[model samples]
Target: AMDCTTGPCCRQCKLKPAGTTCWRTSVSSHYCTGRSCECPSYPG
Candidate 1:
C-alpha cells in the first residue's frame, strides 16, 4: 500500500517511501505532515 488512507499505523508510515497520502489527521509526530514524517509544529 503506497497510500495512507488511514492513520500512520502501517509499516510504510514508519519507513514512508513516496506517494503516501496525507491529511490533517495524518499530521502527527509519527505521521506525514510534510514531504516526510516530521514533528507537529502547532499544538493538537
Candidate 2:
C-alpha cells in the first residue's frame, strides 16, 4: 500500500516506506516528521 488512511489514532501517522501498518507514534501526534522526531519541541 503506497497510501494509508488517517484515523483518530493514526491521524498524524507517517508511513515510511509504505505497508507494515507503520504508524507514527514515537513523536508525531503534534509535530512535523523529521524535525519533530529529531528534536521534540512539543511540551511532552
Candidate 3:
C-alpha cells in the first residue's frame, strides 16, 4: 500500500494497533507523494 509514484519519501512506519493510537485511517493513501512530503518526526 505504498506508491509514492516514484518521488517523495518518508511514508511508512505505521505501527499502532495493539493499543490503538495511529490515525488517518491507518495510513495507506498511495503512501506519500512528491513535493516535500511530510509526516515523519517524533523522537527525542
* Number of the top TM-score candidate: 1
Best by lDDT: 1
Ranking under lDDT, best-scoring first? 1, 2, 3
Per-residue lDDT of model 2, residues 1-44, tens digit only? 43343543233563322222323467554333332223233532
Off by over 4 Å in 1: 1-13, 24-35, 38-44
lDDT of 3 by residue, 1-44 (tens): 54442222433433222222222344432322223344233211
Model 3 whole-model lDDT (C-alpha atoms)? 0.30
TM-score of each: 0.24, 0.18, 0.17
In order of TM-score, best first, we have: 1, 2, 3
Give stretches of model 3 more than 4 Å off: 1-30, 40-44
lDDT of 3 at 23: 22
Between 1 and 2, whose lDDT is larger? 1
